[model samples]
Target: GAMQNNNEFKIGNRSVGYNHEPLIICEIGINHEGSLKTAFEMVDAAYNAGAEVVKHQTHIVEDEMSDEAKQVIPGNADVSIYEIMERCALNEEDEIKLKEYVESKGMIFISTPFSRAAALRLQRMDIPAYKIGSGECNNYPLIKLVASFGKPIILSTGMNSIESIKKSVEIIREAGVPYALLHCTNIYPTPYEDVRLGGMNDLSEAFPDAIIGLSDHTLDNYACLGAVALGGSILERHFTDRMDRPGPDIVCSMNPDTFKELKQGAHALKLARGGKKDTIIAGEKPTKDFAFASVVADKDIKKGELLSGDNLWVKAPGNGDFSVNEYETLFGKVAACNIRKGAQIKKTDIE
Candidate 1:
């Protein structure tokens, strides 16, 4: 395992610092339904979803699929995957438009290329990086071609075993490119129990050379949050206008409003993971205020009375002794003279 803890691939500054927000990628996939107008609408929705990047897919049907494969495989095997992907394909002109339009919306443009030709086309367009879809994890040629560009790569290890993922990582590293590995499950509308968030831990252990993250297919954001808790540095999820949309991904895709909520959910989990160890403890002091034991006067003694836990009952703030984690030492201690009942125990009052 390489140094999984290394901060090597900080692709975007927005997600670099511990306090900075998460890097949200709205995966547009093929939900555009083969229409540039629909693609633009998807981009707009991603932008509105507060995504830092909007991702698409590029596949040269003729090159990537054999004639027979195209004729009988997708639409024939399963109408959902076949028809939706076919409708999502776009010409070079349309892709160029989509890239330009996404850029105009103040977000980075990213796409997954399924074939060497598609990769080359996206390269020419100056795409920021390559996202290796799970279906193409075994496509070494495509991986090599994309890695040859020397741009950053985000590889999704879905529908694959640990050994396969290890092989794919080796291939990407051999190409001498910076990369991030996203733990994913290839199942459409993947079930949360099947997510195996532990896969993220495996990726980090197996490919410590690359940054680790999650490419989520589960409908809710809990899995993504769990991924971050396990040290994920990136999170990618499919996006759509509505779950009722007529597309393969819509069922799992997060709508614009839900995507925003998901981003916040991931960030909140990040916070729970703890921040830099340098916090002054000032912000955490409030919690102590609630539980920290305080010294208090037990009875209506005179001006000077002994302060002790025996005399002073433990209570909330403003009622008695308030010192965090100091109950035992203060026990059996005396209070200064004339302390009233329920008066807080202080350091100076103890004999």
Candidate 2:
């Protein structure tokens, strides 16, 4: 960890950094509704769509919330938040199977553990890293507990401010673990205007050592691509294999087709970023040879004659002795030979 790249953190062998294509993490999460078969199917769809990392939510409801928490209905969910999670909890045996299934396909498997018990379960399963949800950004004790594992952690900062997250960030730092901060807005189907992409700059300037990314909840891939162009190295979004699946997150989740676009588009955008502007690359040379202008004889001329605009002009097929740039250097220059009409001007023809 000491000699590793400062701008990147590892989730297993996958090194997340701007030097590579953005890591598009497909959030399988609780959309599976505790069905291990659905989880495997989601992983299959995700891999077929070129997903790099499959992320899920680990919820130990008893350890995570009190009994009254079941009465709290989330604005985006159909039932009480705790009830949904309780119904959505994947059994430990099923979770092990899900992780193994996802891992068998050579994709990274990560999960966000919602409670200390959940984190311990993932730790027992030997997960490479932990994803902390936005609500946990200010849970100093929870961050401290996860950071103690000494693996990388990706914590989302959405409901919390940069100042509030610093304490949690410090816990991860003090643990000497690699970490990434994501700019999340916490709104389901997060409106385009509220994506607040510029906040990534705040994370960048405040936590210079940590990699920054976007946990996008938008309707499409536009914001994720925009983030990639601005040095976002990881992109996470809720994903489902089929759109008709009954789940609250389905409104913002991407189906296989759209997920493919996000994967390919983000790569294209990543490659397009960070190049020096106004510089001519080698690929333009062949086009420049025939497309650019070069000085040429517009009319027939005799030796010992002074070259004038009447006899000289510029034309295409730029592979010529005199470039258009030298057109001004040609005027008033004496002709060194008998020049013919439409012949590209050569230094030998003009003294």
Candidate 3:
């Protein structure tokens, strides 16, 4: 089985390499509602939930969205999707504050950059890493721009073709940035079958050099577990205060409690994954003995008497005596000494 190379990437001196223990990245996205204070609170929540990284999407509406895109979205007068992106766009001051908060809580501060401008802004803020959103997987220009920072790039592949993803990945590689790709599905509240969990496997096969992960938007924790089982190195999931909150992503976002449970269960399952080879259990020998049959004396036999089926019986442990498996081996052997009724036959008792 192939394993991800630890030396090629750096989140620190420690390896951000492939692990059974899924690296948790809590996606704050626009759930912060453009409030720095709320973003800070969410950072704390991510740390409390044992997440390794707290991620936010960095976007400048003017640079990333067209005027037509801004106009087509309906329903809310106060905000459009592009407006929300602008609102969620953390300014230099806000970025510095968020970085500081995440640092204080001992978590990595990551931000997804949707444009060159956003990438430059995050680089100026000295973020730990850059995440490329699924929507931008085919945006080779943005991928190149983010990779120019020479930071770890966590790329999402949601609505991208294999050719496009390969192109974007080539861009990152050319920039010499340490990078990873996460399998994702663009649909909000994606159905289980549509989750395309096998995409992670395809990614591992496609980008054998880069770490593979899951950018899960499913409604439950099962998909995350499946990702871990399939050898995902990292897990990115949307986070929110409440699932009932009005937001495009909240319908599938993990609430605080559910996030905690997911974290705990995922980690525990990783512990169970352990290593590649099957291990020798400590109690296997005893268990085998209990499950196998041994020969036993049906009645007392005098010294030097020949053993036979009439004088011996066979049964498994927890019943009495030797196992049935020893019947042939013990049948013709002479007793070394006088044997008691119902005693287990031993090799030493045979000549």
Candidate 4:
């Protein structure tokens, strides 16, 4: 989010950008139900699945939620939003253990801080990068507080317009930290119809300096894969060990198998992406040689016979003096030798 258009940044040890392989974030956000053991289990699942980054939610429910929040219930949960966060939020002691475990397994550990106090806790923990959830993205003052830390940030832009998102982006821009803006839909188990990839295009054009990505909550990795094809550089999905387990977010969270698929599949899309078809790479040279047609004799031709389509035609095995591109130049030229039937045409074979 700096003034400079640098498109990449380091999240822990992993460097990501528009040019790098898409980084898949395994967001174990409250899926563990406030149990350190469950958090470790989820981390192990992600580690075994070849995941590189794991994102946790750093929540201090009292500081993050107010009495008004206790009166409101999230659509995905039966209880008040405050009680849900209060019950699911991991305590400081457990979070420290969780971060250490995820890092011990060689995966980058980053988290979203939902409140000022939570942000302070993560800051003291020296989290390499921060993930600003969609709701917090519009919290301009809170964003400035994190931006002042100067680490890379992955900001989710959901439930906010470009105009509103711009203000927070400018705060980070002034602070001079690297950042990525994620296109997201706030819906839990978001329907396929609402998984708007077209919004990513808008993000791409609006913030050319910032790396663009998708923080998906859809049912599967299909939308994540599609986002990568459209130039997503990072992908985040709520991750759970098993869908059979219970939690408000469990319905939307991806299991280990799908997380693996999303990680590997998005990378495949990245490798298959980019580069204009203006020219072929060296890898395709061998295929091009035999696949492309070359000019060849369709039938026998006598010396001084005028070459025409009857004698000269395009055929396979392109390694010839003349190729399909030059086949038309052979017209009206007299045969310079006793050209045999089905022989490849040479420069000297025509006048």
| Best lDDT among the predictions, by candidate number | 4
Candidate 3 wrongly placed segments (more than 4 Å): 2-8, 71-80, 274-278, 283-285, 295-314, 318-351
Checking candidate 3 for backbone clashes, the offending pairs are 293-323, 293-324, 294-322, 294-323, 294-324, 295-322, 295-323
Per-residue lDDT over 134-246 for candidate 3, one digit per residue giving the tens place of the 0 to 100 score? 88898877787788788888889998877779998888888888788888987777889998888877777777788887888888888988877666778888987666656
Q: Sort by TM-score, best first: what order?
A: 4, 2, 3, 1
Provide the lDDT at 208 for model 3: 76
Better of 1 and 2 by TM-score: 2
Q: Which structure among the candidates has the greatest TM-score?
A: 4
- Backbone clash count, each prediction separately: 17, 0, 7, 0
Per-residue lDDT, model 2, residue 318, is 86
Q: Measured by TM-score, how close is model 2 to the native structure?
A: 0.86
Candidates' TM-scores? 0.78, 0.86, 0.81, 0.91
TM-score of 4: 0.91
Q: CA lDDT, every prediction?
A: 0.74, 0.88, 0.77, 0.88
For model 1, how does the per-residue alpha-carbon lDDT over 1-351 read when each residue is reduced to its tens digit? 222365555454444322345566788888777888888877888887788888899967766765555445432136544444566799898899899998899888889998888999998998877899998888877787888898888888887887887777777788887787888987777888899888877777766566777898887788888877766778888888767777667777888898888788878776777456677777778876576565555677554454454566556673344553566676655555666677676666666
lDDT for each residue of candidate 2 in 1-351, tens digit (9 for 90 to 100): 211224876788888876766888899888998788888889999988888799999988999999888778887976898888888899788899999999899899999999999999999999999999998888889999999998999999999998998998899999999898899988888999999888887888888888888998899989998888788888999999998998778889998999999888888988887656787799998998789998999888899888888888999988898898899888898988899999999878877
